[PDB]
Amino acid sequence: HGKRLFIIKPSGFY
Amino acid sequence: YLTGFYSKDLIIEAVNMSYTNAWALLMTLIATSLTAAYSTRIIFFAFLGKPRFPP
Amino acid sequence: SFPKYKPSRLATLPATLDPAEYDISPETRKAQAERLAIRSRLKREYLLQYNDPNRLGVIEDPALIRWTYARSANIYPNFRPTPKTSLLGALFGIGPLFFWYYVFKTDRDKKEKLIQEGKLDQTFNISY
Amino acid sequence: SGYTPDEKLRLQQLRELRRRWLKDQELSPREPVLPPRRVTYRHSIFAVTHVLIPVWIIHYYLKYHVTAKPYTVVERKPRIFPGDTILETGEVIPLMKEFPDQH
Amino acid sequence: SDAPPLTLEAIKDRVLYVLKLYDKIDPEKLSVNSHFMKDLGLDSLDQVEIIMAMEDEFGFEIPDIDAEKLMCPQEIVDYIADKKDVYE
Amino acid sequence: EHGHSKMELPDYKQWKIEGTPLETVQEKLAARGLRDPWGRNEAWRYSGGFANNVSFVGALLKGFKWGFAAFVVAVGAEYYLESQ
Amino acid sequence: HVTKDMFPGPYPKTPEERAAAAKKYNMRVEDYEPYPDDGMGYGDYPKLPDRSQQERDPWYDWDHPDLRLNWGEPIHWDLDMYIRNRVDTSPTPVSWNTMCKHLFGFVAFMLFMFWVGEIYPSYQPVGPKQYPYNDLYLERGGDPTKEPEPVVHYEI
Amino acid sequence: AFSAPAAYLTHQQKVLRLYKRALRHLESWCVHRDKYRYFACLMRARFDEHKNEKDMVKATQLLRQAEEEFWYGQHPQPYIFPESPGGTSYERYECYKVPEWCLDDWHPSEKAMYPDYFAKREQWKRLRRESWEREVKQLQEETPPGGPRTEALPPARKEGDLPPLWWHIVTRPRERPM
Amino acid sequence: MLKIIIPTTMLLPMTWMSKHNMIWINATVHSLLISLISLSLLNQLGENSLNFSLTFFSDSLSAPLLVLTTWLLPLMLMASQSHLSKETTTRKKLYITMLILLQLFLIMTFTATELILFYILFEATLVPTLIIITRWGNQTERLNAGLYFLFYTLAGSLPLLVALVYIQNTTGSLNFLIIHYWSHPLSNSWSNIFMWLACIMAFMVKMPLYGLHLWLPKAHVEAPIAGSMVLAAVLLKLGGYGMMRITTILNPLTNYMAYPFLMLSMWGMIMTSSICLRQTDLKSLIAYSSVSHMALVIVAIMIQTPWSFMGATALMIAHGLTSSMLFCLANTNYERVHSRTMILARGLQTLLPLMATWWLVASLTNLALPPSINLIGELFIITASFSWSNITIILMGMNMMITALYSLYMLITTQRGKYTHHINNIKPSFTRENALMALHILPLLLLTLNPKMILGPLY
Ligand SMILES: CCCCCCCCCCCCCCCCC[C@@H](O)O[C@H](CO[C@H](O)CCCCCCCCCCCCCCC)COP(=O)(O)OCC[N+](C)(C)C
Ligand SMILES: CCCCCCCCCCCCCCCCC[C@@H](O)O[C@H](CO[C@H](O)CCCCCCCCCCCCCCC)COP(=O)(O)OCC[N+](C)(C)C
Ligand SMILES: CCCCCCCC/C=C\CCCCCCCC(=O)O[C@H](COC(=O)CCCCCCC/C=C/CCCCCCCC)COP(=O)(O)OCCN
Ligand SMILES: CCCCCCCCCCCC(=O)SCCNC(=O)CCNC(=O)[C@H](O)C(C)(C)COP(=O)(O)O
């Protein structure tokens, strides 16, 4: 099913 | 002849025939009776009656 | 008739069983109106300061700063030596010290006396 | 009782904006982009790099280092019964004295 | 979890299903925009009972201050959708 | 792969108080002169496969018959094999 | 960015001073009551009710939902005591005095009956166990060079 | 939670809340459905017999012994929905709600993924930037002198206007963000 | 020893002739290099000491403290790199000069084979600290804090000078070797009682003892970050080191002169542990935790048994590292929040996960979790005090429970829960802060592998 959402999360890059 | 038997039956037998406190004897016997009682409560209230969950 | 619920310090009276809001007078309604008014004023100020796109910081709370100042840095200037304060200070700051000193002194005196008599069985007490 | 007209209008507009925002949260097929860059068999290798190698290392460590020092590994002496034979000496433990056996 | 993503039409269907089993109101007369106090002549206690029925059926409970001011099935559907963050 | 199949709700006219222990509730409310408006709403809890219930003792002996048959077969086999 | 007037001040006897303080703490003049002018340094700080902070309205849209607080409202002197993670004064189904009475009675009765049962123990109609070799003298402590008094066992 | 509260609760609201609580605790006591329906109908009967009382002194005299009776038989372990303020999963997902503004601190490498989402994000930010300037003036001109009396906010009245103070209500994280 | 003292001195001309944008790099690199040189001192022998010359000697008590002192300076520079961004070049160079002078004075103090030289440097360590506290401090109470810190110390330490010169007049030498070898019992007399009090009070005020600890929360709260770490890590250990050095001539008077201080410490540990529970500030909470731990160290030193001394040294090192880490974390939180209040910022674990991990590790170490050296020192002191008297276990267990309670309260209030809504300047944690926490914590988990290096001379 094409219902993928955006998961807001803090910047884990640093 | 189940897993809990080989332990609990011997526990109760050894407890019944030792020079121990009598109140502990009575408390243990009432405790195992209540153990059976709440097992019955779980089974009866979660597996027997008519369904009560949302539609 | 039913047994009454007696409130205590750690179990307060429920709002439903409280009798203050059943004896209603116009001044009580006025008081509730003023309370809601000041609460709504504070809420409006906070929401105005909160949704501002230009703000990029922490909304300073006067209540929190006032509470911290009252708890920490305003105790001594409002302190006065009174019989209650003096008695409480003397008790709570002196009694435990002397109580523990007496207990430990008695225990160590007993131990030393037993050591002098030699009836203590200190075998294997190598580490100390 | 019930909604006032101002409350109804505000709730309707807020609901419209909320639904727009929620719909905007969806991810398109190309929305997630990852840049690629690189510099029985499963169980067979697993038992080798996870079981066999620790056994080898620990066996070496115990056999040639731990047992080098005295009293590091001490084993309870095996039970000796009447009738068994000892490997080191070969002597035979004498049997019992033939207790009376009924039932 | 495996919970299906309930949608607006599903919510409306469930609301009407619950209402149509409330025999105090006739299924034919009711509509998604029908009122409760005036168009159906229901008591305040009756409205509380409908609210509790939807509470039980949907598995989440509505606060009193928000439950006492829901008078139409459409706004009940809207409230449930806002609570559960339904897109369409 | 998720649960997307466009489920369709049943018809509301299927649920009836008939054949459920809600008759006793309705009758004792009518004896004192009232009715339960929500009687049909829960008829589904007594209508479908949930209609038949099992007692506690019957629940405990869930597989008594098969186990007893296997036990008898095993005992007979042991009797006929050891007697040799 | 806070003026000197905003900060807490000494307890004030005068009504005009009292009014100024009540307005400062963002509360009604007749709703404001300072701590008693004792030696302790509470000074000019409102004595809010000892009502806890777990039982505030859980459905109101608080500015701080976890603590159940509003921005700018006066803060209880003992907020860190009541943060829903610590002591709470939520009303209970049973009265506090009866709860204490029942718990103390149950514990005291249990202790007394345990002591009573200790006074009257429970056993079996048997004699003491018999061990062969001088009550297993060598296997319990040893001391083989003392030749203990030999205890013999009565066959029956 | 959505609706702003009033300064006080009327007698009708108190009666309705007591009715709801009594029905909930009766359902908790009577586990099974048929028993619950029977006793709920009995409670409704005993609840509506004083519906038509006229004087308010006697009505306030009632609903006091009613509250005492409720407190005496309140089932000290009532049923609480899992998402209720007393439920087993009340604040279970409150640790997954990350604020929207956190996305402003993402590294450009992280923003390289999901480009369309961030474009829509910039559009929303511009919309908010203009709407705030309009809303502050609208609220300033709409509020009565002396400060607001209730915490109810007015809707948008013009065509291009948006409801005042909408950004942090519209951009709630989710019910179950993860 | 001069191979250590000379490079520390050369750090000053190195800093003052550096370029305007390269002072931090040079200072950090050469401070780390100096720490490596200091590592050689750790290889002590079971015999007397490493008597370098007539002026400096090193023991297995001085070696861990010296290594910690030399290791702390790079961390202080990395911590101070943040809030000195908008500072002129001359003032930044003056700050680094003060830090270097503090390190040099501490290094010369910890060896100090003669007691008068030890006292001179022990009071010399007071000027750079006061300048740092009162100059680069944010709050307006830094002046009062500096006055308290100066006078509480100096009033206690002034009779110590008179006691020392009197001892030199009678004994004839103050060299610690001669003092140890020629020690004679102190008779029970009023003059000897006052000599004991003079020689002890100067070190007990700095530790600090319960009842004289009022200067410590002020000095720790109002100081900048570097001053806070140097106070909590090294400057508190001066009193304990001096007390363990000087109790060699106070026997057998101590056998009954330790009762007031033992009771004060064993009750003040409970009092300050309880105080930590109800605290509206983070730095104040950490300062009171330091007071509790130092009270335990006081008890250990006053017991005067080998296990007491070993546990005291281990607890000294462990508490220094842990308190420095906790102050670092509090400063990183305060820089973003700009408030310094525990309940103002909540739920930071959702926004900063790695800093939440560092918080958890620091709290666990402070909680005295096995097999960390915190618990090694704790348990050694517990066993020694139990040998002293069987009733001390009640007080020590109460302290342990309260310590766990307030440590986890500090962790939970700032890390768990729902984040505060009206704060939107919580930027992702820099690499500098993560590196600072890692360099704080890794030596602890490494020293737990070789405890004998920090167990003191009575190992
Ligand atoms: C596979 C190997 C594994 C183990 C590796 C171990 C390496 C250890 C390196 C770290 C050493 C720590 C420093 C030790 C300093 C204490 C000893 C020092 O003071 O001794 C001095 C001597 O020091 C050395 O000459 C210089 C060592 C300094 C450099 C150590 C190696 C690492 C330096 C790294 C610097 C940066 C590298 C480049 C970065 C870009 C003076 O000795 P001296 O008192 O006369 O000796 C008298 C006795 N004699 C006559 C028998 C000699
Ligand atoms: C407040 C925060 C902490 C600060 C530091 C606290 C520690 C300071 C306390 C001083 C420790 C003890 C001082 C004296 C100990 C000697 C034992 C003596 O006190 O007991 C009796 C002594 O009797 C009386 O105590 C005489 C002294 C009475 C006068 C002293 C003042 C007492 C109260 C003052 C408290 C003030 C402390 C803080 C000052 C700022 C025993 O009588 P005796 O066996 O015959 O004489 C023993 C000594 N000999 C053998 C050398 C002859
Ligand atoms: C944070 C504040 C702490 C303040 C600490 C101040 C108290 C320190 C303890 C007393 C300090 C003075 C002691 C003197 C220095 C020692 C010198 C010495 O030992 O010589 C003695 C001399 O002893 C003295 O002269 C002592 C006189 C003390 C006068 C000053 C009193 C100061 C206050 C006394 C009470 C304080 C004690 C408790 C303080 C607790 C902290 C507040 C030997 O005399 P001889 O001449 O050799 O006699 C031999 C022939 N028979
Ligand atoms: C197990 C727990 C048991 C708990 C038992 C609780 C006690 C039960 C008995 C309660 C006694 C009473 O009814 S106390 C009676 C309180 N007084 C009145 O009801 C007077 C007028 N009532 C109204 O006006 C209301 O609004 C109303 C008409 C009801 C609805 O109006 P709606 O048109 O807006 O629905």
TrEMBL record, chain A:
It is found in: Mitochondrion inner membrane. The chain holds residues 50 to 63 of 189 of the full protein. Accessory subunit of the mitochondrial membrane respiratory chain NADH dehydrogenase (Complex I), that is believed not to be involved in catalysis. Complex I functions in the transfer of electrons from NADH to the respiratory chain. The immediate electron acceptor for the enzyme is believed to be ubiquinone. It comes from the Eukaryota. Complex I is composed of 45 different subunits. The lineage of its organism: Eukaryota, Metazoa, Chordata, Craniata, Vertebrata. The gene is NDUFB5. Belongs to the complex I NDUFB5 subunit family. This is NADH dehydrogenase [ubiquinone] 1 beta subcomplex subunit 5, mitochondrial.
From TrEMBL, chain D:
GO terms for cellular component: mitochondrial inner membrane. It comes from the Eukaryota. Keywords: Acetylation, Electron transport, Membrane, Mitochondrion, Mitochondrion inner membrane, Respiratory chain, Transmembrane, Transmembrane helix, Transport. GO terms for biological process: mitochondrial electron transport, NADH to ubiquinone. The chain crosses the membrane at residues 44-62. It is a single-pass membrane protein. InterPro entries: NADH_DH_b-subcmplx_su6. It is found in: Mitochondrion inner membrane. The keyword ATP-binding does not apply. Accessory subunit of the mitochondrial membrane respiratory chain NADH dehydrogenase (Complex I), that is believed not to be involved in catalysis. Complex I functions in the transfer of electrons from NADH to the respiratory chain. The immediate electron acceptor for the enzyme is believed to be ubiquinone. Belongs to the complex I NDUFB6 subunit family. Complex I is composed of 45 different subunits. This is NADH dehydrogenase [ubiquinone] 1 beta subcomplex subunit 6. It comes from Sus scrofa (Pig). The lineage of its organism: Eukaryota, Metazoa, Chordata, Craniata, Vertebrata.
Automatic annotation (TrEMBL), chain F:
One of its GO terms (cellular component) is mitochondrial inner membrane. The keyword Plastid does not apply. It is a single-pass membrane protein. Its main location: mitochondrion. Keywords: Electron transport, Membrane, Mitochondrion, Mitochondrion inner membrane, Respiratory chain, Transmembrane, Transmembrane helix, Transport. It comes from the Eukaryota. The keyword Chloroplast does not apply. GO terms for biological process: electron transport chain. InterPro entries: NDUFB3 (IPR012576). It is found in: Mitochondrion inner membrane. PANTHER family: NADH DEHYDROGENASE [UBIQUINONE] 1 BETA SUBCOMPLEX SUBUNIT 3, NADH-UBIQUINONE OXIDOREDUCTASE B12 SUBUNIT. Accessory subunit of the mitochondrial membrane respiratory chain NADH dehydrogenase (Complex I), that is believed not to be involved in catalysis. Complex I functions in the transfer of electrons from NADH to the respiratory chain. The immediate electron acceptor for the enzyme is believed to be ubiquinone. Belongs to the complex I NDUFB3 subunit family. This is NADH dehydrogenase [ubiquinone] 1 beta subcomplex subunit 3. It comes from Sus scrofa (Pig).
TrEMBL record, chain G:
GO terms for cellular component: mitochondrial inner membrane; respiratory chain complex I. It is a single-pass membrane protein. It comes from the Eukaryota. GO terms for biological process: mitochondrial electron transport, NADH to ubiquinone. Its main location: mitochondrion. It is found in: Mitochondrion inner membrane. The chain crosses the membrane at residues 103-123. Keywords: Electron transport, Membrane, Mitochondrion, Mitochondrion inner membrane, Respiratory chain, Transit peptide, Transmembrane, Transmembrane helix, Transport, Ubiquinone. Complex I is composed of 45 different subunits. Belongs to the complex I NDUFB8 subunit family. Accessory subunit of the mitochondrial membrane respiratory chain NADH dehydrogenase (Complex I), that is believed not to be involved in catalysis. Complex I functions in the transfer of electrons from NADH to the respiratory chain. The immediate electron acceptor for the enzyme is believed to be ubiquinone. This is NADH dehydrogenase [ubiquinone] 1 beta subcomplex subunit 8, mitochondrial. It comes from Sus scrofa (Pig). The gene is NDUFB8. The chain holds residues 31 to 186 of 186 of the full protein.
